[PDB]
Write an enzyme that holds these catalytic residues in place. Structure first.
Site, PDB file in Angstrom:
ATOM      1  N   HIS A  41      53.626  91.524  94.747  1.00 37.78           N
ATOM      2  CA  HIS A  41      54.417  92.595  94.180  1.00 37.78           C
ATOM      3  C   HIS A  41      55.898  91.947  93.927  1.00 37.78           C
ATOM      4  O   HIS A  41      56.728  92.677  93.312  1.00 37.78           O
ATOM      5  CB  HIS A  41      54.321  94.136  94.767  1.00 37.78           C
ATOM      6  CG  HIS A  41      55.163  94.101  96.150  1.00 37.78           C
ATOM      7  ND1 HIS A  41      54.526  94.178  97.252  1.00 37.78           N
ATOM      8  CD2 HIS A  41      56.597  94.090  96.551  1.00 37.78           C
ATOM      9  CE1 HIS A  41      55.281  94.303  98.136  1.00 37.78           C
ATOM     10  NE2 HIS A  41      56.667  94.239  97.783  1.00 37.78           N
ATOM     11  N   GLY A 143      62.996  95.320 101.328  1.00 36.64           N
ATOM     12  CA  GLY A 143      63.482  93.774 101.576  1.00 36.64           C
ATOM     13  C   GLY A 143      62.521  93.137 102.642  1.00 36.64           C
ATOM     14  O   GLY A 143      62.554  91.838 102.771  1.00 36.64           O
ATOM     15  N   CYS A 145      59.462  93.042 102.939  1.00 37.85           N
ATOM     16  CA  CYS A 145      57.995  92.755 102.648  1.00 37.85           C
ATOM     17  C   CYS A 145      57.901  91.228 102.652  1.00 37.85           C
ATOM     18  O   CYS A 145      58.706  90.372 102.370  1.00 37.85           O
ATOM     19  CB  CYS A 145      57.747  93.198 101.063  1.00 37.85           C
ATOM     20  SG  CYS A 145      57.974  95.028 101.045  1.00 37.85           S
TER      21      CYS A 145
HETATM   22  C1  LIG Z   1      61.386 100.454 101.181  1.00 35.57           C
HETATM   23  C2  LIG Z   1      60.389  99.998 101.937  1.00 35.57           C
HETATM   24  C3  LIG Z   1      60.239 100.239 103.557  1.00 35.57           C
HETATM   25  C4  LIG Z   1      59.458  99.401 104.321  1.00 35.57           C
HETATM   26  N1  LIG Z   1      58.608  98.677 103.903  1.00 35.57           N
HETATM   27  C5  LIG Z   1      58.581  98.064 102.643  1.00 35.57           C
HETATM   28  C6  LIG Z   1      59.289  98.956 101.710  1.00 35.57           C
HETATM   29  N2  LIG Z   1      59.127  98.338 100.315  1.00 35.57           N
HETATM   30  C7  LIG Z   1      58.017  98.895  99.663  1.00 35.57           C
HETATM   31  O1  LIG Z   1      57.096  99.653  99.832  1.00 35.57           O
HETATM   32  C8  LIG Z   1      58.372  98.809  97.982  1.00 35.57           C
HETATM   33  C9  LIG Z   1      57.106  99.118  97.452  1.00 35.57           C
HETATM   34  C10 LIG Z   1      57.113 100.118  96.574  1.00 35.57           C
HETATM   35  C11 LIG Z   1      56.132 100.841  96.173  1.00 35.57           C
HETATM   36  C12 LIG Z   1      54.898 100.013  96.144  1.00 35.57           C
HETATM   37  C13 LIG Z   1      54.939  98.940  96.657  1.00 35.57           C
HETATM   38  I1  LIG Z   1      53.425  97.599  96.572  1.00 35.57           I
HETATM   39  C14 LIG Z   1      56.066  98.445  97.322  1.00 35.57           C
END
Ligand SMILES: Cc1ccncc1NC(=O)Cc1cccc(I)c1
Ligand SMILES: Cc1ccncc1NC(=O)Cc1cccc(I)c1
Lengths: 304, 304
Positions: A41, A143, A145
């Site tokens: 992604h 950030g 990921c």
């Molecule tokens: C904001 C955040 C917090 C913690 N761990 C990860 C994240 N980021 C995401 O999830 C961004 C994202 C959004 C929708 C789908 C997908 I694939 C990825």
């Protein structure tokens, strides 16, 4: 003396963390040998995330669109490919800090350490468990990921998790290092509710053995039970059913303490039925399930 | 999303761990520049430990009696001196992995990460707090002495603790890197009971703010209190008295959440007076006090 939620020393993994940027998205990558692994992604914009066609999005990307930075130096990208939900960026330089490693797909109930990273830089390390519903209860912000989960056996790092997303419920979903999600989760901003988060029974028993080893014994009772009787209680309290494989895995702890697994199950049964009555076990007021039987033995013996 | 007991990435410290042997005793040392720091009780035999005269014991030791091994290679000891309860072994080689560092003597209530080691090898990392009674609730076995506590600010490691001993109560005592014990503890096998382990009130409030940020809000109430009224409750429950300095340190968390510090104190007051009623906060069934206000801000912002 003492029992703590202990993570593996993170040094071997810190030396693998890099920053990957594609367009306006920056996340973490894992550099092992001449390959950088990262969530696919990274090629998406916020708009793409509703229903992304990764193969179509990846067509518009060339090697030079993937900016990979290790500390303050830039890595040259000579190849890129998508394997399930991860991108593999071939670079022209092998990571000189690459430790001995394996990619493993863990089972639910198994634990691992996470090195949370932002912009390729480590922020902290903590111990997690893959929940029976295939989510992890981590600590991740935007950030993070590409941050990875791992276990260490002497000098070999077994990578088991790569962080991809947060569900609307604040729990986390990710993949193994082959890019396959744990559970039914997909890398798209959609309705993905998690299943029942049951308690990892074999882990709670292992932690009860750790408590006995460390002096916390108030919960030991005069009772015993059977696997079938215990499992009737476990079902009622959304605990995972205990099997003979679980009893066998608790064998070393049973042998060390002299407390038969079924007697420990009977202590657990009374704890489930009557609660802690305002008391604590290993500084906790709830039954801890994120220590495996292997973790308890390792911590109680000092394996380095 | 999520909140975890997070330790600093341990890599910078792993590169400093060495094994120190003197006679039949082996423990951990910390190699920084051309000096190896270790607990002075490395010169003791089990018999010496009842009432050791360290100056007299050290007279019978020469540079060649201190065996210092970094991984699999031997360091040459060219000098030795005792500074309080630590030995400083001058070696002929500067540690090439020496990070930017400082020696700091922490205050009770402050947190740090511990890299538990055995025979100079890291076994795990966990987060601790210096208790108000100057003990730490760690996880250490025989051979762990010389393992260190530290904090990291970007690239600078501030070493604050060196493990020396376990009290008969299973809690841990140690020194700063100048060899001065935290608390009244002495490095001898004697009756050393710990004082009252009170709860670090400012830390519990910081963790309550972390809970609100992460979605756990059931404990927010319609009440407020005053510092003096709150402190009457805090005294009754063996909580540390809250001061205006503590309120000031919670300012950023109060500003981020829009919840005045005294309103949060009133939620804490009701939690102390009525308990959790079988509910949890950030996956805990008790009030957590080993997260400082700085830790909560750091984790909730992603400082690397
Ligand atoms: C904001 C955040 C917090 C913690 N761990 C990860 C994240 N980021 C995401 O999830 C961004 C994202 C959004 C929708 C789908 C997908 I694939 C990825
Ligand atoms: C056995 C153990 C467990 C955890 N942390 C440390 C230890 N080791 C000791 O305390 C050995 C010792 C004994 C009496 C006095 C002194 I100074 C040192």
């Amino acid at each position: 003396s003492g029992f703590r939620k202990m993570a593996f020393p993170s040094g071997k993994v810190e030396g693998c963390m890099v920053q990957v940027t594609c367009g306006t998205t920056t996340l973490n990558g894992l550099w092992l040998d001449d390959v950088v692994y990262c969530p696919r992604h990274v090629i998406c914009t916020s708009e793409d995330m509703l229903n992304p066609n990764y193969e179509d999005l990846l067509i518009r990307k060339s090697n030079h669109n993937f900016l990979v930075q290790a500390g303050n130096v830039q890595l040259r990208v000579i190849g890129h490919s998508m394997q399930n939900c991860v991108l593999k960026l071939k670079v022209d330089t092998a990571n000189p800090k690459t430790p001995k490693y394996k990619f493993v797909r863990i089972q639910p109930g198994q634990t691992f350490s996470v090195l949370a990273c932002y912009n390729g830089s480590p922020s902290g390390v903590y111990q997690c468990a893959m929940r029976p519903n295939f989510t992890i209860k981590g600590s991740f912000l935007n950030g993070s990921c590409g941050s990875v989960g791992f276990n260490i056996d002497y000098d070999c790092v077994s990578f088991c998790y790569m962080h991809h997303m947060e569900l609307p419920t604040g729990v986390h979903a990710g993949t193994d290092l082959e890019g396959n999600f744990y559970g039914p989760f997909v890398d798209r901003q959609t309705a993905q509710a998690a299943g029942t988060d049951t308690t990892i029974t074999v882990n709670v028993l292992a932690w009860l053995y750790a408590a006995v080893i460390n002096g916390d014994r108030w919960f030991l009772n005069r009772f015993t039970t059977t696997l079938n009787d215990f499992n009737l209680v476990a079902m009622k309290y959304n605990y995972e059913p205990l099997t003979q494989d679980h009893v066998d895995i608790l064998g070393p702890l049973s042998a060390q303490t002299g407390i038969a697994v079924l007697d420990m199950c009977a202590s657990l049964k009374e704890l489930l039925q009557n609660g802690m009555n305002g008391r604590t076990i290993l500084g906790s007021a709830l039954l801890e399930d994120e220590f495996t039987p292997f973790d308890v033995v390792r911590q109680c013996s000092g394996v380095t």
